[PDB]
Write an enzyme that holds these catalytic residues in place. Structure first.
Site, PDB file in Angstrom:
ATOM      1  N   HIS A   1       2.155 -21.037   7.728  1.00  0.00           N
ATOM      2  CA  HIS A   1       2.503 -20.705   6.409  1.00  0.00           C
ATOM      3  C   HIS A   1       4.205 -20.315   7.021  1.00  0.00           C
ATOM      4  O   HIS A   1       4.934 -20.450   4.955  1.00  0.00           O
ATOM      5  CB  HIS A   1       1.679 -19.798   6.657  1.00  0.00           C
ATOM      6  CG  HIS A   1       0.643 -20.116   6.437  1.00  0.00           C
ATOM      7  ND1 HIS A   1      -0.660 -20.455   7.112  1.00  0.00           N
ATOM      8  CD2 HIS A   1      -0.168 -20.942   5.224  1.00  0.00           C
ATOM      9  CE1 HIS A   1      -2.026 -20.698   7.107  1.00  0.00           C
ATOM     10  NE2 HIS A   1      -1.927 -21.269   5.598  1.00  0.00           N
TER      11      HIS A   1
ATOM     12  N   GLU B   1       1.023 -15.964  12.706  1.00  0.00           N
ATOM     13  CA  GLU B   1       2.123 -16.715  13.039  1.00  0.00           C
ATOM     14  C   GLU B   1       3.153 -15.724  13.515  1.00  0.00           C
ATOM     15  O   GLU B   1       3.477 -16.013  13.848  1.00  0.00           O
ATOM     16  CB  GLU B   1       2.541 -17.461  11.656  1.00  0.00           C
ATOM     17  CG  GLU B   1       1.249 -18.131  11.507  1.00  0.00           C
ATOM     18  CD  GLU B   1       1.007 -19.285  10.052  1.00  0.00           C
ATOM     19  OE1 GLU B   1       2.203 -18.888   9.485  1.00  0.00           O
ATOM     20  OE2 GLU B   1       0.273 -19.687   9.641  1.00  0.00           O
TER      21      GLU B   1
ATOM     22  N   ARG C   1     -13.884   2.296  -8.544  1.00  0.00           N
ATOM     23  CA  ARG C   1     -13.307   2.424 -10.092  1.00  0.00           C
ATOM     24  C   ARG C   1     -13.709   1.518 -11.248  1.00  0.00           C
ATOM     25  O   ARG C   1     -14.296   1.051 -11.224  1.00  0.00           O
ATOM     26  CB  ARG C   1     -11.883   1.684 -10.241  1.00  0.00           C
ATOM     27  CG  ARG C   1     -10.694   2.079  -8.945  1.00  0.00           C
ATOM     28  CD  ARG C   1      -9.167   1.222  -9.278  1.00  0.00           C
ATOM     29  NE  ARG C   1      -8.130   2.040  -9.110  1.00  0.00           N
ATOM     30  CZ  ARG C   1      -7.802   1.360  -8.224  1.00  0.00           C
ATOM     31  NH1 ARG C   1      -7.707   1.258  -6.578  1.00  0.00           N
ATOM     32  NH2 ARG C   1      -5.905   2.717  -8.143  1.00  0.00           N
TER      33      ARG C   1
ATOM     34  N   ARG D   1      -5.673  10.197  -7.476  1.00  0.00           N
ATOM     35  CA  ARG D   1      -7.402   9.895  -7.739  1.00  0.00           C
ATOM     36  C   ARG D   1      -8.001  11.184  -8.493  1.00  0.00           C
ATOM     37  O   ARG D   1      -8.103  11.504  -9.515  1.00  0.00           O
ATOM     38  CB  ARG D   1      -8.096   9.255  -7.553  1.00  0.00           C
ATOM     39  CG  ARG D   1      -8.338   7.700  -6.342  1.00  0.00           C
ATOM     40  CD  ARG D   1      -7.912   6.623  -7.477  1.00  0.00           C
ATOM     41  NE  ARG D   1      -9.555   6.301  -7.683  1.00  0.00           N
ATOM     42  CZ  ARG D   1     -10.157   5.353  -7.966  1.00  0.00           C
ATOM     43  NH1 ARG D   1      -9.597   4.696  -6.190  1.00  0.00           N
ATOM     44  NH2 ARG D   1     -11.617   5.804  -8.113  1.00  0.00           N
TER      45      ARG D   1
END
Lengths: 251, 249, 242, 240, 244, 243
Positions: D5, D77, D165, D220
């Site tokens: 990747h 990786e 949420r 929040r």
């Protein structure tokens, strides 16, 4: 008339009965009722065949559950609505201990919950345990009748095949959870497999109902010689004598 | 001194052939139980494991404390089993969670709700924390023989004294989601009481070919909201466990 | 008493906010003796408590007994009495070949192989030590030249099957734990013990500080003074946390 | 390219053993630019990688994308290519009333509300940070005078229902997460983010060192704070 | 004679049949078979009543499963042993959506696994999903027959009572796991409750067998708790025609 | 922006109710280019979005990134913006021996080896595709005559251990996943990918339609990593049918 959705029974049909004997097979209901006095057929709908009889002068119900926790949960719930407070399961079973022979009788103290319906009544932490009076009545009845009896834990499976680690099947595969499981239960001292007790015992123990479980051993998973459809019927009759005799002590 | 096991400080010789152990939680109760039997003698004391030996009807019997909780219990039961014990009778004092279970009553446990961790080290959760039938029978018949008011059924066995028994009178005043509303649930399901060792004891015995049972005297009832009745209830549960032991030798 | 098990009142603590918590009652006085003005407070079941003084501040030493359940009672009741910092000291085996007897282990977090931790937080929550406590222990180990390993401990509700021991009555280990030791070793776990998952989880999830240090006295993977070093370390760490 | 990747070879790393791993590919160059000799290596999918030098030693900056799954690919990786130390730098809200915008959070361990962590270790295993990394982050935070909170982070596989949420398309939160924010708050959890449970678990269980620092951007219950980035770079210096 | 343990059937009895229609109620078997050519009773043992019939010249089996995953699992396995490779369940169901009417026909794409038997075949992560060809045949048959039809997810419960959050019961209570569950499934778009599909679909999808599921609505649970050939039955027979 | 991550407003969609959602941002423009009037909308993090037109109707193409978590953000925010139908187009490793590189796999439902799906529905709920969407994909595939397989897909939160790859830094796979590939294979599972369990679960449980198609890039019965588009044609043709 019916007071309940599936069984096709009314409270009047029970004639005051408070104890039910509950075999799995509809065809066994008449046979069990025939051990008692003045038996009469009440109803037959789906896998639920019911008869009433008299034991020592008291009304008793015999009603089949069908195979598995789901149908059992229906029969037990609706019988409870009708007035039943004590349930005795009489079954046939496959033993998994080498020392338990065909013809032996097994009385179950509690079950390994390899079912789904039990969880609809209590979380897995709750024990699928039999009522002490019922278990006592079964053990004493076994002594009265004369039987080779083992008392202990039963594995209660939602399947006949992979859950009892059978490989002689269409796929020949057993899912990871159950691979090696029979040997594990054997090592933990589990006596046998059957398919209704975890649901029956959990739903009763968690709702103030009394339940017990007795079975006749018709095959042993460890032995190579498999009895015929002759010896197995005799074993059935033996365990059936025991469940009726046990009922007498619970009225 | 020689020991055949890692914690208890005992050899097979110390047991003199004993196959049955009475197992209270508190080391202080060990001598008291042993005192009801013949030829009682101290054996060993290490951590929470105090052991005495005695004799019933000519057979040796062990009394050995387990400490609090499944983990300590699992050590005692394993090592006693190594030494030759095959039958275990737990004796405790307990509260109750049913309105009609009264102080002074006796509880015999058929099986336990597994709210512990150690039981899972012996059998998966699906396996029942079930008492042995012979042990349960002996306890019930002993209780009857002395006329105790006895309840026979399910016990909830918790790894904690506080949140697992849904107690809010604590430092945090909080109970984790799993246990919020749990007492009322067990109550509705007919559970008699809470204690802290039986899920481990019963599971480890039922899954390893050992016999176990449990009896307890009720010394308080939270749903119903004294030192004398506490020691009197004690003496009664104790006489029951010893009388049951006699029937199991 | 202000609490149900410990037999202590708030006044007994004399303002103490930190407790050293060994497992064995028989180690309590020994630890207290390393500090000033040591005095016995109480003894009930496996909870023996002493008070001492460190740099003019009161400190508690109190045993927990074996296992998370006993530990949870001690911690709850000490917290009620005003303790806000808990330091566990113990002796342990190891499951890594590179860890030798005499070495010291500081635990950053524990594998939760117990039951009591779940009575405080769901399994997703980490049984993690407080950073200040862990720092104090590591720096105290360093100040005395101890060979120290810092990392993860597996915390088991059992001494036998949970630590994958087969040398038992049954000789059986349940499926869950079969092959488990090799798995923890491969994941870099240092050692097994039996109380830290409960201690660390109940503290981390309730605004209490906790840490753990232990002396290695055996190593099952391989063919006294160590207890003293770990003990000096926990007392020195306590000093820094007052 | 060696790995599947990232599009990188061992040689691209020039011997690097430490990687700073932000979530956003667009932040990679910005972090690299704070160090010596920054050079772009590769960009594929959400994985943008740069190399730089810190006190004469090669270091990698590589984005992870959002979430444990993409994080797990970047870390694996990079480990294949020789990286042994990973420092996550993120942006974050907070769930504690006293944690202010501008504050820096250093994570000791994470609540595992993800799935990828389970592909490395069972749930009983702690998603715990490496002590040396956490120490370096805390000490770098002190060195620059940042207001710092050290503790537990909730690491969620979702931005919406897993962080309870309700301002969403369905307005629904599944039973598991109903009431969960209040529970984490009572348990002293500092904040939500979306990568640390996977990062910390996969590293702690494979002998790799990982730490995490995040700058608080919202609360929040209520980009100079640069601060978090300066801290992760200063921490890296101490970990070479 | 029998080649299987419970059904009382030999391979020869099936006469080459590779598809079975599997109703829950033994008493419904003869009724379904009568809609086809050359219906013949084969066996009746426990809750397993089986008939053979003919559809466009090809043998078909109708065999009851009884109530629940466990008996269903026995019937399906033993039918598979005898050569059945495609299974169409025809059931009755309680709808949990306001807009679904009594008498409507529901085709199940996959099921919520509120059973235990499915776990004996695949872990919970595996989907209790219907075969695409079977589902397509059922949807197309519903057009041919004419019926108000809905296609979607079904909740498949090991109990009739607490798992379907029924309160008309002896105890009048429901375990924590199921308290409030009906409204949860409703909000997730689940169409209906029944008691066999999770087991059927899971055991078939994980074993190289094809399965589909159709049911007639006998009650709407948003309104009420206790509830020729219906549209659903005609549809399952027409779908069978398309799958032979 | 009307949403927190995508950088889009409802106006940007021009009435679009269907989105094609590839994993790779770099693929978005390429897919849009197969339709009419393609226009770039935005690019933030792993979320690249284009608009285009199909038979006169606006359609969105938007990348999800790798994994359920980023997928869950893209789907939620697209739903907020008005999208009601989602078609994932991905790449995949086949785990059945006869499936060829280049084959097209249409997913009916997924094995939930992810975590994000659990944030929408408990594990018992099926990660099932919408019937109309699956039908459109299958019928588009046959219309162009592509080699196609229809069935169950294993959807993993990791590329490596959860797909039982051993050619890794540690060379180890946690207990849960040891032997898992052979198990899925025996159960008829076709393939591994990394987004469908989340996509299908969050859509099926929230009244959104979703379908899933992927092109095979490696056969895992032979190798873990390929040596160093029919599916795309199909997802676009399927979209035509669902407008």
């Amino acid at each position: 008339k019916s007071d309940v959705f599936h069984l096709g029974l009314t409270k009047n049909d029970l004639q005051g009965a408070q104890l039910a004997i509950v075999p799995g097979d509809p065809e066994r209901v008449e046979k069990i009722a025939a051990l008692m006095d003045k038996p009469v057929k009440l109803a037959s709908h789906r896998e639920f065949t019911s008869w009433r009889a008299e034991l020592d002068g008291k009304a008793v119900i015999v009603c089949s559950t069908g195979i598995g926790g789901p149908s059992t949960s229906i029969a037990v719930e609706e019988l409870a609505q009708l007035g039943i407070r004590t349930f005795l399961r009489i079954g046939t079973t496959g033993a998994i201990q080498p020392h338990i022979n065909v013809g032996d009788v097994l009385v179950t103290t509690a079950s390994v919950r390899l079912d789904g319906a039990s969880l609809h009544f209590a979380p897995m932490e709750f024990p699928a345990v039999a009522d002490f009076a019922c278990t006592t009545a079964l053990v004493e009845a076994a002594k009265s009748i004369g039987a080779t009896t083992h008392v202990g834990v039963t594995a209660s499976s939602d399947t006949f095949y992979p859950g009892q680690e059978r490989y002689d099947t269409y796929s020949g595969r057993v899912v990871r959870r159950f691979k090696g499981s029979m040997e594990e239960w054997q090592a933990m001292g589990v006596m046998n497999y059957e398919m209704e007790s975890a649901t029956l015992l959990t739903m009763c123990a968690s709702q103030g109902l009394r339940a017990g479980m007795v079975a006749g051993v018709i095959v042993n998973r460890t032995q190579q010689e498999i009895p015929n459809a002759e010896t197995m019927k005799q074993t059935e009759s033996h365990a059936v004598k025991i469940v009726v005799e046990a009922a007498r002590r619970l009225l």
